Amino acid sequence: SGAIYVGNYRVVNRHLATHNDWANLVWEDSSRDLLVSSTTAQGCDTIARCDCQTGVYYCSSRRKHYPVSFSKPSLIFVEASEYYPARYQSHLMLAVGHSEPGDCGGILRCQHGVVGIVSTGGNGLVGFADVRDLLWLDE
Numbered sequence: 001s002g003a004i005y006v007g008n009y010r011v012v013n014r015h016l017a018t019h020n021d022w023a024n025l026v027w028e029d030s031s032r033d034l035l036v037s038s039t040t041a042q043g044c045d046t047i048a049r050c051d052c053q054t055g056v057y058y059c060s061s062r063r064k065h066y067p068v069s070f071s072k073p074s075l076i077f078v079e080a081s082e083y084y085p086a087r088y089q090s091h092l093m094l095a096v097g098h099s100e101p102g103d104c105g106g107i108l109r110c111q112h113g114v115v116g117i118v119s120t121g122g123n124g125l126v127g128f129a130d131v132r133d134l135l136w137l138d139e
C-alpha cells in the first residue's frame with residue numbers, strides 16, 4: 001500500500017486503486033501500473049523533475065528506508081499476475097534491493113523530491129513506476 005499526495009491529486013498503483021479512485025478518475029495507464037484520482041484536500045508532496053539515478057525508498061516489509069542506485073525509466077518485461085497478463089511495463093526503473101508484493105506504493109525520493117512508487121520486484125530486485133514526466137501533476 002501507498003500513495004503520492006500532490007495538489008488536488010492522489011497517485012496510486014493502478015492494480016491497488018479503490019472504488020473512490022475510479023469514481024474520481026483523472027487518468028490511468030495499465031502499461032505503467034498508474035492511476036491518478038482527484039482529492040478535496042490539498043497535497044504537499046514535491047515531485048522531482050530530474051534525471052537522478054540514486055535515491056531512498058520506503059520498504060514496508062522491513063519497516064525501513066533503503067538507499068538505492070536505479071536505472072533509467074524503460075520498458076521491462078513483467079511476469080503474469082492476478083492483475084495483469086505477462087507484458088512490458090513502460091516507465092519502469094529497476095534497483096537491487098528488497099521488495100515483497102505488499103511493498104507496492106512505497107515512495108522513492110531523491111534530493112529533488114518524489115521520483116516514483118514501488119510497483120514490481122522479486123529475486124533481490126525492486127521496480128519503481130516513474131512519475132517525473134507527469135508535468136501536469138503541478139498544474
Ligand SMILES: NC(=O)[C@H]1CCCN(C(=O)[C@H]2Cc3cccc(Cl)c32)C1
Nearest residue numbers: 033078081099100101119120121122
Ligand atoms: N506492476 C505489476 O505488474 C505488478 C502487479 C502485482 C504483482 N507484481 C509484483 O511484482 C509482485 C510479485 C512480487 C514479488 C516481490 C515483490 C513484488 Cl512488488 C511482487 C507486479
Ligand SMILES: [Zn+2]
Nearest residue numbers: 050052110112
Ligand atoms: Zn533528483
